[PDB]
Symmetry: C5
Subunit: 103 residues, 5 copies
Amino acid sequence: TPQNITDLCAEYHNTQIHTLNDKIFSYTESLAGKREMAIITFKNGATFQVEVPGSQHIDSQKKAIERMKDTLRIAYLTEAKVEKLCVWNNKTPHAIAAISMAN
Amino acid sequence: TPQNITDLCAEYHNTQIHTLNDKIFSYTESLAGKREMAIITFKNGATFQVEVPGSQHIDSQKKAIERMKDTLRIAYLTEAKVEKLCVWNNKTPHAIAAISMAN
Amino acid sequence: TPQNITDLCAEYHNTQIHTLNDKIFSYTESLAGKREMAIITFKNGATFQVEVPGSQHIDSQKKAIERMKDTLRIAYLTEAKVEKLCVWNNKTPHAIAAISMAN
Amino acid sequence: TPQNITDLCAEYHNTQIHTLNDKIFSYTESLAGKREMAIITFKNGATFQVEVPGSQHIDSQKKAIERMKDTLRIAYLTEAKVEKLCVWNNKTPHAIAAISMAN
Amino acid sequence: TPQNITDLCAEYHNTQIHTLNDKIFSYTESLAGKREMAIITFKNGATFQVEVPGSQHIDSQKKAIERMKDTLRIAYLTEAKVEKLCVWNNKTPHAIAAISMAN
Ligand SMILES: CC(=O)N[C@@H]1[C@@H](O[C@@H]2O[C@@H](C)[C@@H](O)[C@@H](O)[C@@H]2O)[C@H](O[C@@H]2O[C@H](CO)[C@H](O)[C@H](O)[C@H]2O)[C@@H](CO)O[C@@H]1O
Ligand SMILES: CC(=O)N[C@@H]1[C@@H](O[C@@H]2O[C@@H](C)[C@@H](O)[C@@H](O)[C@@H]2O)[C@H](O[C@@H]2O[C@H](CO)[C@H](O)[C@H](O)[C@H]2O)[C@@H](CO)O[C@@H]1O
Ligand SMILES: CC(=O)N[C@@H]1[C@@H](O[C@@H]2O[C@@H](C)[C@@H](O)[C@@H](O)[C@@H]2O)[C@H](O[C@@H]2O[C@H](CO)[C@H](O)[C@H](O)[C@H]2O)[C@@H](CO)O[C@@H]1O
Ligand SMILES: CC(=O)N[C@@H]1[C@@H](O[C@@H]2O[C@@H](C)[C@@H](O)[C@@H](O)[C@@H]2O)[C@H](O[C@@H]2O[C@H](CO)[C@H](O)[C@H](O)[C@H]2O)[C@@H](CO)O[C@H]1O
Ligand SMILES: CC(=O)N[C@@H]1[C@@H](O[C@@H]2O[C@@H](C)[C@@H](O)[C@@H](O)[C@@H]2O)[C@H](O[C@@H]2O[C@H](CO)[C@H](O)[C@H](O)[C@H]2O)[C@@H](CO)O[C@H]1O
Ligand SMILES: [Ca+2]
Ligand SMILES: [Ca+2]
Ligand SMILES: [Ca+2]
Ligand SMILES: [Ca+2]
Ligand SMILES: [Ca+2]
């Protein structure tokens, strides 16, 4: 299996790496019906979503989606540096597929 | 798909953005029957709930309701600055739909 | 809908408010069969349980029971000041219905 | 309903209280099949498990077993002082039934 | 039942102990389809996965797999020293079976 986010991201169609090397600037979370999601931004204005669970997910990606929103919240609150995100770039905002964190 | 809490709130009827730019002053949680809910307040007396799950919520919102109460608890304990709340204003106290945090 | 713990407590029979204004002194939790519960005390010796889930609880409370134990453990570990508890006072020890944290 | 760990421990056969008054020295966790468990140690070498779930457990204990593992991990990572453990002494290592924390 | 990670690790085929005595250098998390997993690395370049749940795993392991990803995330964010890992060495990268923390 790939051993880093760059290699993991490159296996998938319609994906790309954003290199942030920065903490999350804002964290937004919604419980509204059909927008049960999180949205993050960085200081540079880059904005990312964790997608609303739907038909494009295999429904074990379901637990993974919830984990990812947990990780973004704790990263925000701990000012953890986000190294890279692997995103689907065919969504607006870009939708997070993977995150890497390093000091 | 919205990129911020203001645009997301505008997708919903009978909602309003409140801007607090302040940490939560009090956090209340209840397990009592029919009042399984959370209430937050700010120093200025603004008071909001996460509603008891009911018929105004769809299946997809149930997990998000639990998530939002987790988020408010950790935000209170971290003294995290709350930027904005998107709220349903036909409820008293007003009911949270979404939160944004930035500092 | 109540906007504070005192008003919420008054919607039930056999409840009362304790005003602690103090951090949790001790936190005890048990996985022993039929005693799957938590117990907290304060420096003045006031002692409270989260009750074992049983037939006296409705389905909607089961998540909220789990949540309350999560809340008491993180409040203990962060030395958070507990303002008030709403408790059923026909249990020994008093059983927690709601909690408020402020200051 | 007991009001302290010592009184809870005395409801059960084959138990005893260990009085540690110290933080957890090591935390071990396993996902290997048939050893889905946690093990903690103290500096003096006292060693305790949270049992692998099985037919020795009633249904109401399964959430509490998961909770106890959560509690031990956060206790370890916060260096929380463990006052007492109630354990079954007919297991090797001794199996945790309850924990109390105080400072 | 084993009392430490080395003895646990000797219970399985195709496993070995790695002794790190270091905090995790990076934490990677993916929800990408069929690759829902975490990857950690240490400063020496040692790289480990928590494997995607699949047919090598029995039902009793599924909660433990999710727990182990929770553990690595919080270990990462607390800069907790990892003492040893027990891994399956017939995977790439080596797959985590168990973890011990001590400092
Ligand atoms: C506890 C209390 O009475 N506080 C009030 C504020 O009202 C609460 O908070 C607002 C946001 C809402 O959730 C109310 O239902 C609560 O009782 C009150 O805020 C104003 O409330 C009105 C309600 O229609 C509008 O939301 C305004 O936009 C708010 O400014 C303030 C000011 O009147 O006074 C107390 O702090
Ligand atoms: C361990 C012990 O005996 N503690 C007592 C207090 O009682 C405990 O805490 C109260 C809140 C209740 O849960 C009891 O069942 C516990 O044993 C005791 O508190 C008073 O308790 C009575 C009820 O029995 C009323 O609730 C009063 O409002 C409480 O002040 C205090 C003071 O009497 O003494 C020991 O700390
Ligand atoms: C190539 C890389 O990114 N790192 C390597 C180490 O290998 C990685 O980590 C090990 C533990 C294993 O998961 C490999 O699959 C990874 O690529 C490599 O560690 C040694 O790896 C060998 C197996 O190839 C043995 O497991 C040794 O015990 C490990 O120390 C080291 C060489 O020491 O080089 C880079 O750090
Ligand atoms: C809120 C906003 O419009 N911000 C702009 C950035 O765009 C956002 O973030 C990127 C990563 C995508 O999720 C966008 O959909 C989102 O609106 C914008 O970032 C650039 O977006 C490009 C696509 O339009 C592309 O992904 C590029 O890689 C990325 O750098 C930046 C720079 O143009 O400006 C912000 O204001
Ligand atoms: C690794 C080791 O040998 N530790 C010693 C303790 O034993 C461990 O911890 C106890 C609580 C049990 O879980 C043991 O199975 C485990 O090895 C030892 O504890 C004493 O062990 C006695 C018999 O093994 C008996 O259980 C007794 O209750 C307990 O106090 C302590 C104290 O002598 O020393 C460690 O070195
Ligand atoms: Ca800062
Ligand atoms: Ca402060
Ligand atoms: Ca202190
Ligand atoms: Ca220390
Ligand atoms: Ca550091």
